[PDB]
Design a protein around this ligand. Structure first.
Ligand SMILES: O=C(NO)c1cnc(NC2(c3ccccc3)CCC(F)(F)CC2)nc1
Ligand SMILES: [K+]
Ligand SMILES: [K+]
Ligand SMILES: [Zn+2]
Length: 364
């Protein structure tokens, strides 16, 4: 029972089977199997694992995938399960930045099913919040195609899965703090006012992957979805804790509170972390802890943290373990001295404010 209340529980999902997805031609490709085992091992080292309720992985079904993806796309990825290597190579090469092994399809299904089980546990009160240590990632995957190490859009599917077991209009916030724009998530929800998508990402006037002006601040959503897509694009600066904290203070949290989400999904890539070989930014583990802590003030604390990217194995292990520590209710660690904001970060924050003040009274 929870008569009289009870201490909130944090769920954790991790299944070593998701390590089987691998790059048979470049075994040093940074989207490594041991991304998830290293993160899991750090949770054991820090004694966080035994404090969590372990949530089992499961496979997503093909009908669950159709919540966001076309039958053609599902069928093509499914067909890779039985391909020979030369045909896996050719099929991967048809996409932007995709490698495929015979286990990729099953691993993508497990990453999605793990997050469905976690959202289910949160929404039915089995746990208050959860962390999902999953791969391959999701947020670059589109309705019709794979992209950027992602086959199916785990976070987008989880938002639709949540609506499917509560009510169609359940308000879901997705905060995407992966250093890359989540092009797939933006596109899936661009006309939808029930899912608010807020992405922070390195942009560089369109030069940074995925190299599209869709990631710019002026893309605010379409139709009913106008105002429900918030891009915070970083240009010309080595961004870190001061800039992300300022973005949360001026943009993410005011908009999120006004939206009043009923569930928060974090597309939690850690490739903006200090030390990441791809992102080039310097968010610290303590910074990620503070971002997590702020999001826990939303949705009565119903937050699911979903691993996306992040490629320095030590950085992502420490950063995601910080986030779990915050979900468990530990007191936030001290931030380093916040250097004054990079001046271009103020420019970006002010551009987003101008783009979104028409839709959010909290910004006016
Ligand atoms: O998921 C991600 N990060 O979290 C992610 C990161 N990099 C790529 N692609 C790029 C990449 C691919 C393999 C190894 C390093 C980088 C290749 C094309 C590029 F040069 F344009 C950008 C980098 N794709 C997805
Ligand atoms: K992002
Ligand atoms: K939206
Ligand atoms: Zn990324």
């Amino acid at each position: 029972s929870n008569a009289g209340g009870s201490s909130p529980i944090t769920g954790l999902v991790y299944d070593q089977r998701m390590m089987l997805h691998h790059n048979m031609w470049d075994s040093h490709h940074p989207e490594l199997p041991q991304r998830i085992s290293r993160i899991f091992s750090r949770h054991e080292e820090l004694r966080l694992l035994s404090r969590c309720h372990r949530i089992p992985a499961r496979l997503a079904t093909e009908e669950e995938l159709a919540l966001c993806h076309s039958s053609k796309h599902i069928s093509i990825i499914k067909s890779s399960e039985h391909m020979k290597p030369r045909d896996l190579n050719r099929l991967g090469d048809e996409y932007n930045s995709i490698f495929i092994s015979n286990e990729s399809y099953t691993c993508a299904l497990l990453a999605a099913g793990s997050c469905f089980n976690s959202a289910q546990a949160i929404l039915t009160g089995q746990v208050r919040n959860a962390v999902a240590i999953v791969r391959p990632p999701g947020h670059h995957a589109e309705k019709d195609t794979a992209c950027g190490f992602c086959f199916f859009n785990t976070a987008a599917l989880t938002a639709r899965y949540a609506q499917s077991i509560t009510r169609e209009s359940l308000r879901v916030l997705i905060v995407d703090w992966d250093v890359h724009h989540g092009n797939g998530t933006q596109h899936i929800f661009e006309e939808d006012d029930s899912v608010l998508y807020i992405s922070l990402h390195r942009y560089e006037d369109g030069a940074f992957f995925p190299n599209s002006e869709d990631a710019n601040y002026d893309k605010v959503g379409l139709g009913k979805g106008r105002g429900y897509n918030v891009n915070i694009p970083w240009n010309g600066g080595k961004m870190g804790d001061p800039e992300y904290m300022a973005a949360f203070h001026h943009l993410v949290m005011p908009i999120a509170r006004e939206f009043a989400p009923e569930l928060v999904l974090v597309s939690a890539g850690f490739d903006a972390a200090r030390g990441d070989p791809l992102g080039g930014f310097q968010v610290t583990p303590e910074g990620y802890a503070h971002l997590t802590h702020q999001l826990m003030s939303l949705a009565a604390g119903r937050v699911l943290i979903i691993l996306e990217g992040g490629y320095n194995l030590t950085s992502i292990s420490e950063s995601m373990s910080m986030c779990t520590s915050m979900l468990l209710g530990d007191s936030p660690p001290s931030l380093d001295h916040l250097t004054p904001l990079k001046t271009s970060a103020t420019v970006s924050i002010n551009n987003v404010l101008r783009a979104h003040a028409p839709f959010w009274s909290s910004l006016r």
